[PDB]
């Protein structure tokens, strides 16, 4: 009793809105289940087999994407300037963090 949506649909040649109107938006829809399918692909678990490893990659690619979009002619975005300032300050901070410990010796 109280079946899920995956035993309900059984057909996947359609658009999302049709299925919405046919299974979840009908007045007679019993809607008596909540079960989120596992969407991670095995072709990705076999290489990143750890939530920490799946999060480090998910953050590295996020940083890459945020670098690529900010690097017709508007160019007047505060986020590009913020990323530039952050990169410059990070470079200048690591600069005075290796030399400072070179001096202390």
């Amino acid at each position: 009793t109280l079946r899920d949506t995956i035993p309900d649909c059984a057909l996947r040649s359609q658009t999302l809105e049709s299925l919405d109107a046919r299974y979840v938006s009908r007045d007679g829809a019993h809607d008596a289940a909540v079960w989120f399918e596992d969407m991670t692909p095995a072709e990705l678990e076999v290489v990143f087999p750890t939530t920490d490893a799946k999060l480090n990659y998910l953050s590295r690619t996020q940083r890459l994407a945020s670098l690529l979009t900010y690097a017709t002619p508007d160019t007047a975005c505060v986020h590009g300037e913020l990323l530039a300032r952050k990169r410059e300050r990070f470079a200048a901070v690591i600069n005075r963090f290796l030399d400072l410990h070179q001096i202390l010796r």
Binding site: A32, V34, W35, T51, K54, L55
Partner: protein, 116 residues
């Protein structure tokens, strides 16, 4: 003497599609994916609603709601009547046998601090 109602809740064995190699156990709730521990937006709400039971009523404040700390644990009556008719799946038997043990054991270290 027994504290609040947040440290006595039943199982609520909803479901999970994640392998046991990943799932973690947040106290007070069931067993969820591991990604729910690196997200403070959840691991700071599911943990504050627990310790909001150990806190006595003389320490919630001065105008905090009669029965509970409304600023943390309050659901409108419409939302309570709406989530009442929400029903999760049911855990598989071979999976509910150890899930209930993990749940009621990760909670014992709280019903044990409330006594010491």
């Amino acid at each position: 003497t027994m504290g609040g109602d947040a440290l006595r809740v039943p199982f609520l064995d909803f479901a999970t599609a994640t392998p046991k190699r990943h799932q973690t156990v947040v106290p007070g709730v069931g067993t969820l994916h591991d990604c729910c521990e690196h997200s403070p937006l959840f691991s700071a709400v599911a943990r504050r609603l627990l310790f909001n039971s150990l806190v006595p009523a003389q320490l919630k404040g001065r105008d905090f709601g009669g029965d509970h700390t409304a600023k943390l644990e309050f659901l409108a009556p419409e939302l309570v009547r709406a989530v009442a008719r929400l029903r999760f799946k049911e855990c598989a038997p071979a999976d509910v046998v150890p899930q209930r043990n993990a749940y009621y054991s990760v909670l014992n270290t709280f019903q044990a601090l409330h006594r010491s």
